Symmetry: C5
Subunit: 237 residues, 5 copies
């Protein structure tokens, strides 16, 4: 009955809110020193990306939930843990307050193939916007995904995939499985150059039976790509 | 599935004033920080006057917040830039974040907003007035997020289109009967925030908020399918009310 | 259809004893003097008929105090709240919960005016809780026909009548104003009457099937003398 | 319809070890001496029959301690709480949970057995368990819509289970409708903490709880007398 | 109707902590060392209790913001467990270890299935049973923790089911778990009466993906599909003395 999956990079979505009042009290020399240290840290992460042993990206997040998200991908939980711990020990991380995080593993569901590696070990597209949310499938009375027969679940998933293929080109998705790893069953990351495409795809999916009857959603987070020019601007008072 | 037209991107930014810290500042430094906020708001008025957005400020009742800054912009980048420049104001260290909401002004296709045809609605001036709304200087504001239920036999997203259309139609008749008393902005937020809409109401009589929201609650579209978040109520704040608000 | 009266704020505060303790007694006195001035201001509004207010000490950790204020506009209620937060002593009164509502009765009449603009009785104890009516499957209050709801509300009223002289109730409507649909304040000289009336109502179908409750707060009347004792440390 | 006895406060605190550690030992001793005089005053009220109190250390992060106090009026209880909060040492006792209730005897004052239950002597048992609970009002599982006779029978069967733990678990049931966020506060005392797991598990398979009980958080701890109270605070 | 009966072993604490890096950064290295020396002395005291058979303990670093560390401690009484917790909080370094979550439970063996022959013997004298009630912790690379309860929700009410139906559901769940022998080791802590859910579940494995595999497969089995209510999930990596010193080096 159970789904069986292929699993790739381990993923951390690390959401931070900048402690502006504390940062503002810092002398501008201390600020520059801490950003230089962060800049070294990110150069090291770019080395790891270039040799194909992981990926990362940063977006600035709208609203009070976070000021930015660091999305990091590594080939082991140990390498992910080490990134996280070294990040937290940067001087600047004292000003980056933790507001939410998500742990997952890139997931390919069964419902060396170079086209499988490309999904399991995803290169992150440098799209203008990111959208992140976690979700689970419902187990609530007669709306119970995990009691459905495989044939009915397969049909529901087929219909859901038709919708998403129509947003190919517009929206790129990474699906992280998180059963056993975090509080929901998947972490969904979308990338697009038009944020309204996130609204469009997620709305269209909500009226398809697989989500209409069986999806449970967490919080949603949207943001704008942060390269270095925008990163240094972010922190300049 | 519903199709939407989408207009300005919206931020409702709720803040609580840290009176104890503010009180520790001498009045010289308080004036300097208020001067910097006025310059900031003057810049926001320029953006409004060139047609690139809108904004307004209300004082909020109760402990949820002291102020809401409601800002509308033509891109997420611009909205993000307002937010970030605002947090970097000196006075913002005394404006503690207590809640926020991201949405986009939305017109659905459940009913018609313009004569059908090849003519695209974004060129219709009546449609544009609704997608890119002028904010009215009404005495009061009411904000709350909401979603439509997906709960056993009460599942909005499993209804056929013609049934959702009828429910929305009937909801709209109620709303139309508050013309000239309540003005509404509906921001869609599927994909953007934690509920599916952010609802902003404006009225000169706060009791009209209770009236319409109560009346709609006995209409099937809300009685059976609405799920509500927190409600925020407040009073219009112009310059006079603002320097006054911060005089301790 | 409802008639609406004074706008209401329930403002719950926990006292920051650690910081209050750090103040020398002279500065404590100055802050209490300012607070007494503010409260005498509130009493003036009461005595001219433009509002009401009362203060109860709250049991348990949810709060030390509740300030229950009633005013004739949202602007006036907002001004009181803001002037309150600007008192020096308010820096030691940490906000832990609040509720906004309007006195509700479903205007030239004296007994109606007495309901819509209620005098606050100096009863020994207070009980506050918000509530809503369920919209949950077959237990959906707002999908009931008019005549069924009327019968359900009728029966709940008979229970209330039996507590005349034991419990006095103020019902604030809060649809559009706060997170629940009503704020319920009860006053009695015997706190056990709160438990009795609220239990009795819970077995009545209007509440048994359709009530959804928030947190409950219970307290003892604070006059000027008990206020000075509260803060003596 | 119920009989109601002492009003009850369960006051849960976590100790601010970092701040406590900054105090020099003479000041630490002065604050503990003040707490000693406060507790000896509480012992007078206990000795004269006007209330009760006990202290347990609580396992896990929810709390380090619970102060469980019973008084014959809400005013007396409020006065205990406020005086406690104004102790110097209370700055180091951070509030993490509390519960207000009244000792309750349903029908599902001059009598000596009734009085022993309404105004209960607290047993010096090694362990305490506290949790609040309410009865469900959820579709077909609605306690408050049940006929009186059906409720009577469900309570009867529940009481039979409780009777079988006589001599192992002693219970205080506090009614809290109108007073706090659930409908009852449940306090269990036993010298064997596994008896808590046993009695609460067995009740959960009895219809009265299986269908109708809604539980809050659970707290368990160990009796703190004077000997253990000083050691708790010694760094 | 017929309640489950259990055998109960060591009392357990899962103690999750987040490191206050900002504060720790402000200490000079000599004072950091003294605090780590004192911690190493406390852990060697824990090791002594392990080596005389009166408890167990282990430390994992936790991924994500929920915690940096979990200290999982097992002891033969609630008093001993409470004494360990209190001595830990009074370490100097514990000021830098902020509490983010905890769980209290007791190693549980229920009677849904047999754990030993019904020949009249004291189960607590059966060494196989003792190995389960007083479990040696395996030094597996990864840990997974989550609490859970069984639903009492309308037609999905575990506690209204007949004994023989619950036994069938537990039996089927066990066959799935049996298939992960050698890949995932489980400790089930019962927590009815002790904490906010009904069990705390700890999984150990050298491959973190086996956690996802077993939890997913059980979620399609009726016992969980229909009746499980889950809390938060925590996953982590084994921390020995060496990885601990690195964790705290800035
Ligand atoms: C295609 C495409 C898009 C759109 C972006 C694009 O343009 O590529 C796309 C986007 C989304 C989005 C949002 C969500 C979450 C929103 C929601 O309402 O659930 C979203 C949700 C899920 N998808 Fe999705 N998708 N998707 C596939 C295709 C696409 N999908 C294929 C294929 C599979 C593989 C199914 C299989 O073989 O097992 C697949 C699997 C899942 C599962 C796993 C469910 C389960 O295992 O039970 C969840 C949850
Ligand atoms: C009219 C009117 C009022 C009253 C005030 C005024 O007239 O200014 C008015 C006020 C409200 C108020 C409160 C709420 C909040 C719901 C509640 O309190 O139960 C409230 C709620 C919603 N309305 Fe509403 N309205 N409203 C329309 C008409 C009016 N509406 C038309 C028409 C559309 C159709 C879209 C469009 O026209 O662009 C429409 C759409 C929505 C949606 C989106 C529903 C969906 O897509 O599923 C939600 C939620
Ligand atoms: C009588 C009496 C008491 C007891 C105190 C006394 O001794 O008078 C009294 C006390 C309470 C108490 C607790 C509660 C809240 C607890 C609950 O379980 O409902 C409580 C709850 C409500 N009452 Fe209540 N009452 N009450 C009326 C009579 C009395 N009532 C009459 C009549 C009306 C009719 C309207 C009005 O005049 O306000 C009325 C309205 C409401 C509504 C509005 C419901 C709705 O409109 O859907 C709610 C909620
Ligand atoms: C006996 C006994 C024990 C075990 C400990 C011992 O042996 O002392 C005992 C223990 C417990 C325990 C746990 C709980 C909470 C666990 C649960 O799953 O609800 C627990 C729960 C309740 N009990 Fe309980 N009991 N109990 C009675 C007898 C005993 N009871 C008698 C009798 C009455 C009725 C008294 C009267 O009619 O005057 C009574 C009433 C209640 C109510 C009130 C419910 C209601 O009124 O709707 C709740 C809740
Ligand atoms: C075997 C095996 C595994 C394999 C993984 C491993 O070895 O690490 C194993 C692993 C798990 C895992 C995940 C979970 C978490 C459930 C989920 O994520 O859906 C999980 C969950 C539970 N198990 Fe589990 N198990 N398990 C048993 C066998 C195994 N179990 C036997 C047997 C008993 C019964 C004891 C007995 O009678 O002997 C038993 C009991 C429970 C209960 C308590 C149920 C109740 O009393 O209502 C819960 C909750
Ligand atoms: Na932000
Ligand atoms: Na306010
Ligand atoms: Na209090
Ligand atoms: Na503790
Ligand atoms: Na971590």
């Amino acid at each position: 009955e159970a789904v069986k999956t292929l699993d790739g990079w381990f993923c951390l979505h690390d959401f931070r809110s900048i402690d502006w009042a504390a940062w503002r009290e810092l002398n501008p020399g201390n600020q520059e020193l801490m950003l230089n240290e962060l800049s070294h840290f990110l150069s090291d992460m770019e080395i790891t990306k270039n040799i194909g042993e992981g990926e990362h990206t940063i977006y600035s997040i709208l609203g009070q939930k976070a000021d930015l998200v660091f999305f990091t991908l590594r080939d082991s939980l140990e390498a992910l843990n080490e990134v996280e711990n070294r990040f937290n020990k940067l001087a600047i991380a004292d000003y980056l307050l933790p507001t939410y995080s998500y742990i997952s593993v890139v997931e390919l569901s069964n419902y060396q193939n170079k086209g499988v590696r490309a999904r399991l070990y995803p290169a992150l597209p440098p799209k203008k916007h990111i959208c992140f949310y976690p979700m689970s499938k419902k187990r609530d009375g007669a709306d119970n995904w995990y009691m459905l027969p495989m044939e009915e679940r397969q049909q529901l998933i087929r219909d859901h995939g038709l919708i998403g293929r129509s947003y190919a080109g517009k929206v790129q998705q990474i699906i992280g499985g998180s059963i056993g790893f975090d509080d929901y069953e998947w972490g969904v990351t979308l990338f697009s150059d038009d944020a309204l495409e996130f609204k469009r795809i997620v709305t269209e999916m909500r009226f398809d039976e697989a989500s209409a009857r069986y999806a449970e959603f967490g919080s949603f987070f949207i943001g704008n790509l942060l390269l270095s020019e925008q990163l240094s601007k972010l922190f300049t008072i």
